[PDB]
């Protein structure tokens, strides 16, 4: 028998002192169970994750739940293994927490089910794949300016209330229905209301029985928010490797992971970084991100939402994660307030897939021309704000006249947004959007009012809306 003893309790950080020669390894899981001896105590059932070795047979740990009621000197039991999570066909159709316990009220998982440790090294250099091909989504701006890569990592950056969740829901509607592989959703630091709504929507749509869901939400202490993403990832890795099946990974607001890490790091004895973050910001992010990769055994395509604090794109947490992505979309509050949705920034958004031989010469030329016109229009803004249109040269007049229409045509009416505006919404193909943008660039619709280009797709709808308005 090898048992510990609680020494210090400082919020979500707990210290355990062990008998000499039996210190647990880092990332192991410790169990605390305690029946109340009298009326001045409360029952405790809690788990811990080892984080450090301080010396003098003392270990610093992070709790996965609230530490209220802990008493100095209580007994701690070690397990000798990291946190283990059930994997396989059992996990399809269930809802889990960070510790792997189902919470869907559908019953309990048998004690003999295979389960795997959360922590593992990243895939090696020789196992990776390099194939690049386009994943059509049916969104005009995404399919034109920054195509999504099948099997790659996709990121969505945005401030508060800009549209990341709506964009993810639209992507789920447009992709998950026909995907045919396996989906897993790992909400991290999001609203339990949104989690419940999404679960009920998937149950109604029948997408469940091929998906798994893991939830560590806002109410949880930072310990659970630091590891819920890893739990979802280790569930997805089984389907990637042991079965060689296509896996679709949705992560909601991955920024909360680093935020929880920052919250915990202060109590661990580390000195603050530039903006109060932990010193280990880059390595902690890299360890998680490097495991979401496509190997020769199978492919994982991951879509991650990334929150941006105070709309500051120079914040270290958004800044460091730009190197881990393949295609990024940057939502903008200025566009969101203007009334253009999904308010994707057309110049900041990038994608590795926008190459002449990957998308085609016509697509490449159209995208480049659109970006050039938008850049010129962005340059003209300062003079426009003071002297208006009346001082511009003849060429710049045309540049503005076409840039306004292109910018408005970049918007679309989503299926998910039907509950907000009542408009049914539409799905457009890549060829159709390319043809429409080429027609606009050629000047075939300079006689139409700019308001006709807004919140429609397929360009024929632009013409019909203009006719309805009376043009």
């Amino acid at each position: 028998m090898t048992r510990g003893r609680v020494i210090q309790v400082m919020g979500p950080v707990v210290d355990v002192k062990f008998e000499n020669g039996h210190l647990p390894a880092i990332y192991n899981a410790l169990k605390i169970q305690h029946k109340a001896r009298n009326e001045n105590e409360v029952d405790i059932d809690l788990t811990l994750e080892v984080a450090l070795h301080l010396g003098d047979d003392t270990v610093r740990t992070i709790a996965m739940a609230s530490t209220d009621g802990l008493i100095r000197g209580m007994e701690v039991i070690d397990t000798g293994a990291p946190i283990s999570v059930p994997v396989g066909e059992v996990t399809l159709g269930r809802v889990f927490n960070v510790l792997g316990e189902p919470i869907d009220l559908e019953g309990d998982i048998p004690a003999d089910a295979r389960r795997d440790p959360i922590h593992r090294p990243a895939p090696k250099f020789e196992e990776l794949a390099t194939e690049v091909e386009i994943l059509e989504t049916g969104i005009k701006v995404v399919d034109l300016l920054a195509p999504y890569i099948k099997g790659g990592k996709i990121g969505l950056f945005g401030g508060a209330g800009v549209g990341k969740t709506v964009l993810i829901q639209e992507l789920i509607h447009n992709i998950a229905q026909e995907h045919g592989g396996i989906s897993v959703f790992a909400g991290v630091g999001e609203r339990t209301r949104e989690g419940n709504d999404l679960y009920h929507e998937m149950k109604d749509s029948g997408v469940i029985s091929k998906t798994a869901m893991v939830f560590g939400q806002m109410n949880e202490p930072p310990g659970a928010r630091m590891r819920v993403a890893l739990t979802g990832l280790t569930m997805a890795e089984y389907f990637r490797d042991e079965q060689g099946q296509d896996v679709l990974l949705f992560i909601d607001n991955i920024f909360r992971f680093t935020q929880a890490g920052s919250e915990v790091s202060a109590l661990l004895g580390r000195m603050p970084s530039a903006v109060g973050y932990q010193p280990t910001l880059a390595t902690e992010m890299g360890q998680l991100q490097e495991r979401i990769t496509s190997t020769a055994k199978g492919s994982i395509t991951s879509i991650q939402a990334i929150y941006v604090p105070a709309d500051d794109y120079t914040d270290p947490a958004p800044a460091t994660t730009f190197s881990h992505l393949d295609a990024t979309t940057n939502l903008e509050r200025k566009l969101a307030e203007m009334g253009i949705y999904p308010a994707v920034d057309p110049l900041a958004s990038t994608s590795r897939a926008l190459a002449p031989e990957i998308v085609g010469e016509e697509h490449y030329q159209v995208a480049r021309k659109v970006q050039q016109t938008l850049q010129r229009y962005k340059e003209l803004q300062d003079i426009i704000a003071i002297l208006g249109m009346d001082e511009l040269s003849d060429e710049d007049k045309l540049v503005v006249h076409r840039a306004r229409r292109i910018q408005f045509f970049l918007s679309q009416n989503f299926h998910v947004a039907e509950q907000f505006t009542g408009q049914p919404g539409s799905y457009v193909p890549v060829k159709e959007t390319v043809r429409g943008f080429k027609e606009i660039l050629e000047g075939k619709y300079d006689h139409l009012p700019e308001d006709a280009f807004r919140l429609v797709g397929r360009i024929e709808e632009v013409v019909e809306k203009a006719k309805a308005m009376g043009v």
């Binding site: 880092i26 990243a122 250099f125 190197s323 881990h324």
Partner: protein
């Protein structure tokens, strides 16, 4: 067997404190029970601060640390060419071990003031803008700086590819990158055939911060082994900002007090040590050379930031890449106003120098004149001519991706531009004009290319005029 042995006190976040090790040297190598190597940095009175160079999940308090008696060292040799390898000299490509036979210290003094010779020979990058405005010579170090998604990696890859014919060895060091990205770069190099003479050193984001901190030093140590034998080496540091971040994390974990923006005070010393080893050795040293192209990633184009200025003050010149130029159709988007080369002229061949000595100054003046004269329509004849010439030059300097161009053709096209033979072609036709001109030179005027390649000087000016006029007669405006 006999060896001085210490014991571990604290473990966490890739940093270990050990007790004992009476005779450990500063900057030495130590190995734990698992065989994971370690580095000793802080030689405090009571304990030693050990930096772990591997996965530290297997190290527990109370383990024993064994001295090794060697400073940090990496394997070197010709057996590394064409391999992808860790900073420790351990292969990752899975093609078997590397049969190296000797090592070099990773912390070595730079050649002195009496060891070097002034840079006098060119390094052709195959890019017109770089080769005409900011020339780079062997032994020079040039910084590439810009925002994300601008073309730094592509410029480096093209520069490495173009060195196929010259007797030059290339070293590409990726710091803090993503493994799939590194594999993509390796695949592109293999496809274009550059793996026969290049070494790839990778330290991905999953690796502990010490390896990211050590990777550029390992790369330069591998390079200077070839340098001191009379070879010529090209080294590319994929990101020094990542190294700076890793060093900051390591220092903060070692509880050293921070400075500006939590950076340790010795970041300038770190970068100066890393970049000062590039040199052009004198004839007494064999005449070898090593050139470096470090990378720096800014935020929102702020060239006046801490790390950007610190790196800029060290290197010889900088190539500044602008997002505005990138999205306006100008690629590779060299901002000639801020770009500069401190070894200009001496790093260009005679014909290139005498044709394009004044191009950078003329382009900067044209940029200023375009900014000013935009504020009025009543323009003078001289201003109109200068604006036309500047627009044509800007159109000329554009270049596609993975399309290297020999200097004997770069000099011809730039000569045709600067002597006024392009004064009548519309600005929209210059790209096709250049394409047709190269095609016509591939058949007629081949002796011009032979003369330029042999004597490194302009041919007789009459023949240039005759050939250009002959091409212009068959050239037709679209």
């Amino acid at each position: 067997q006999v060896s001085d042995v210490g014991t571990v006190i604290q473990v966490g976040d890739g940093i270990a404190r050990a007790h004992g090790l009476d005779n450990v040297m500063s900057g030495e190598l130590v190995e734990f029970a698992n065989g994971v190597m370690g580095m000793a940095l802080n030689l405090e009175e009571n304990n030693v601060g050990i930096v772990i160079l591997g996965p530290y999940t297997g190290i527990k308090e109370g383990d024993e640390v064994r001295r090794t008696g060697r400073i940090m060292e990496v394997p070197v040799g010709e057996a590394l060419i064409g391999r992808v390898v860790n900073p420790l000299g351990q292969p990752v490509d899975g093609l078997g071990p590397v049969e190296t036979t000797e090592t070099r210290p990773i912390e070595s003094p730079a050649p002195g003031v009496m060891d070097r010779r002034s840079v006098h020979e060119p390094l052709q990058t195959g890019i017109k803008a770089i080769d005409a405005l900011v020339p780079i010579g062997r032994g020079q170090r040039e910084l590439i700086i810009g925002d994300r998604q601008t073309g730094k990696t592509s410029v480096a890859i093209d520069t490495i590819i173009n060195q196929k014919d010259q007797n030059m060895i290339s070293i590409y060091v990726a710091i803090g990158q993503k493994e799939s990205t590194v594999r993509t770069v390796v695949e592109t190099l293999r496809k274009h055939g550059a793996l026969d003479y290049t070494i790839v050193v990778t330290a991905s984001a999953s690796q502990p911060a010490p390896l990211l901190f050590l990777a550029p030093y390992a790369g330069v140590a591998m390079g200077e082994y070839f340098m001191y034998k009379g070879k010529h080496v090209l080294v590319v540091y994929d990101d020094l900002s990542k190294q700076a971040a890793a060093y900051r994390e390591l220092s903060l974990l070692l509880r050293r007090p921070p400075g500006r923006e939590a950076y340790p005070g010795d970041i300038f010393y770190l970068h100066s040590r890393l970049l000062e080893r590039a040199a052009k050795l004198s004839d007494a040293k064999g005449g070898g050379s090593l050139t470096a192209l470090p990378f720096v990633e800014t935020q929102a184009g702020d060239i006046s930031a801490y790390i950007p200025t610190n790196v800029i003050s060290i290197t010889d010149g900088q190539i500044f890449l602008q997002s505005d130029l990138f999205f306006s159709g100008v690629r590779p988007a060299i901002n000639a106003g801020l770009s500069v080369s401190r070894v200009g002229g001496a790093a260009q061949i005679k014909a290139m120098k005498k044709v394009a000595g004044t191009l950078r100054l003329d382009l900067a003046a044209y940029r200023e004149l375009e900014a000013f004269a935009q504020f009025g329509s009543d323009l003078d004849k001289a201003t109109q001519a200068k604006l036309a010439r500047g627009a044509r030059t800007v159109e000329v300097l554009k270049q596609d991706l993975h399309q290297p161009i020999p200097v004997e053709k770069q000099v011809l096209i730039i000569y045709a531009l600067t002597r006024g033979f392009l004064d009548d072609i519309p600005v929209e036709d210059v790209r096709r004009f250049e394409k047709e001109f190269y095609l016509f030179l591939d058949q007629n005027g081949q002796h011009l290319l032979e003369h330029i390649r042999t004597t490194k000087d302009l041919p007789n000016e009459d023949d240039l005029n005759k050939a250009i006029e002959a091409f212009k007669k068959t050239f037709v405006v679209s």
